[PDB]
Amino acid sequence: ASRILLNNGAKMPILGLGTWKSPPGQVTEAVKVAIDVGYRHIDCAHVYQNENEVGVAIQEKLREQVVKREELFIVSKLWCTYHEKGLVKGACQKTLSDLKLDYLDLYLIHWPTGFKPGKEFFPLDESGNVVPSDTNILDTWAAMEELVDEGLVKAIGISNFNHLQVEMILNKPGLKYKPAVNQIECHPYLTQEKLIQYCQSKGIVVTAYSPLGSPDRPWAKPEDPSLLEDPRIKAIAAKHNKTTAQVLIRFPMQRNLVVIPKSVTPERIAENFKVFDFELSSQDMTTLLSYNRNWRVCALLSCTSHKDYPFHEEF
Numbered sequence: 481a482s483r484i485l486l487n488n489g490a491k492m493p494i495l496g497l498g499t500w501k502s503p504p505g506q507v508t509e510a511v512k513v514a515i516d517v518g519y520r521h522i523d524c525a526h527v528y529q530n531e532n533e534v535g536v537a538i539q540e541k542l543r544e545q546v547v548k549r550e551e552l553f554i555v556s557k558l559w560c561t562y563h564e565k566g567l568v569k570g571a572c573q574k575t576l577s578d579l580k581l582d583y584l585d586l587y588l589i590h591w592p593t594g595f596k597p598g599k600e601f602f603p604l605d606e607s608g609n610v611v612p613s614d615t616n617i618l619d620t621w622a623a624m625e626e627l628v629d630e631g632l633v634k635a636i637g638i639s640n641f642n643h644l645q646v647e648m649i650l651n652k653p654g655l656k657y658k659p660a661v662n663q664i665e666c667h668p669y670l671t672q673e674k675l676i677q678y679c680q681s682k683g684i685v686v687t688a689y690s691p692l693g694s695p696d697r698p699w700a701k702p703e704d705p706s707l708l709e710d711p712r713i714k715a716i717a718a719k720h721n722k723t724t725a726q727v728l729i730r731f732p733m734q735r736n737l738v739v740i741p742k743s744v745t746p747e748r749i750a751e752n753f754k755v756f757d758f759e760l761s762s763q764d765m766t767t768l769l770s771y772n773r774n775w776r777v778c779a780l781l782s783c784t785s786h787k788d789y790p791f792h793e794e795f
């Protein structure tokens with residue numbers, strides 16, 4: 481099946497296109513190509529600074545009648561400097577305006593860490609620490625719930641929440657809507673077994689980000705591990721007559737996850753979608769899981785003292 485049922489009653493495509501680092505001068509064509517070759521889910525965020533350009537592509541394909549709005553699943557995320565209850569609606573509306581949509585299918589709290597509001601996405605003190613917000617994440621959640629009730633978003637969820645933070649939301653006094661999704665980093669070097677089983681057991685769908693290990697991440701070091709170059713993964717790919725990237729995308733799909741590989745290269749966008757016609761064996765799956773080393777693409781030193789920094793905990 482190409483879609484997974486969310487706890488709001490809607491279906492979410494298990495494959496989507498990522499847009500972090502997609503240059504604004506390339507992402508419009510990337511999204512147009514993606515829609516042309518079958519993608520129906522686009523993962524966006526205000527902090528990526530390219531939502532206007534993503535929106536141009538979506539709007540053209542809607543106008544061209546290549547796809548209907550109801551067939552698309554568009555996701556965006558509330559940035560950390562907008563956790564204050566009074567800023568949440570405006571942040572959502574700005575994203576809607578840029579994407580040229582009247583609703584989002586899913587809106588996520590991007591990180592559990594709230595930052596001081598202002599123009600800067602990472603407000604710093606003179607010593608380089610991020611300046612936190614005092615807004616409780618439960619209050620941010622209530623503001624997210626209001627977006628559902630105002631028709632701006634069909635579903636709400638969370639991203640980069642650890643199991644205790646997920647539990648906090650689930651245990652919120654007067655909780656109105658459960659998170660539909662927790663979007664987290666997940667790949668063979670960070671397999672996330674504990675957090676995934678917890679979320680799934682509560683009916684929360686997990687989306688795997690950086691499934692290829694984010695080789696274009698700005699802080700990549702020549703000596704870091706590399707999923708796409710791991711000979712063990714290449715061997716599994718060769719056995720199945722697929723590319724290493726295709727194996728890396730199929731892997732989370734078979735764990736009942738949604739997966740959102742990013743590309744701006746038309747050939748790779750198409751390649752990455754050709755993952756519905758083969759199956760990894762249980763042995764393949766267990767072998768890939770065995771490569772876990774708790775290695776993360778996404779974690780910032782500037783946030784490690786924030787009270788809600790998610791990655792101190794085991795999971």
Ligand SMILES: NC(=O)c1ccc[n+]([C@@H]2O[C@H](COP(=O)([O-])OP(=O)(O)OC[C@H]3O[C@@H](n4cnc5c(N)ncnc54)[C@H](OP(=O)(O)O)[C@@H]3O)[C@@H](O)[C@H]2O)c1
Pocket residue numbers: 497498499500501523524590639640663664688689690691692693694695696697708725726740741742743744745748749751752777778
């Ligand atoms: N919620 C969060 O905090 C969070 C954090 C990180 C990421 N995300 C989301 O997850 C998406 C995916 O993660 P990511 O962007 O970090 O990295 P990724 O999808 O793991 O990897 C993207 C990189 O892989 C390359 N690539 C793509 N397909 C390939 C293929 N078939 N063969 C070889 N190379 C290929 C891309 O190059 P080209 O583009 O040049 O083709 C790019 O350099 C993001 O774009 C974003 O939407 C969310």
Ligand SMILES: O=C(O)CCc1cccc(-c2cccc([N+](=O)[O-])c2)c1
Pocket residue numbers: 500525527560590591593777778779780781783784789790
């Ligand atoms: O956010 C994305 O989707 C990609 C940009 C990015 C990359 C790495 C870390 C953080 C980040 C942001 C806020 C807080 C933390 N943290 O607490 O570690 C990391 C953000």
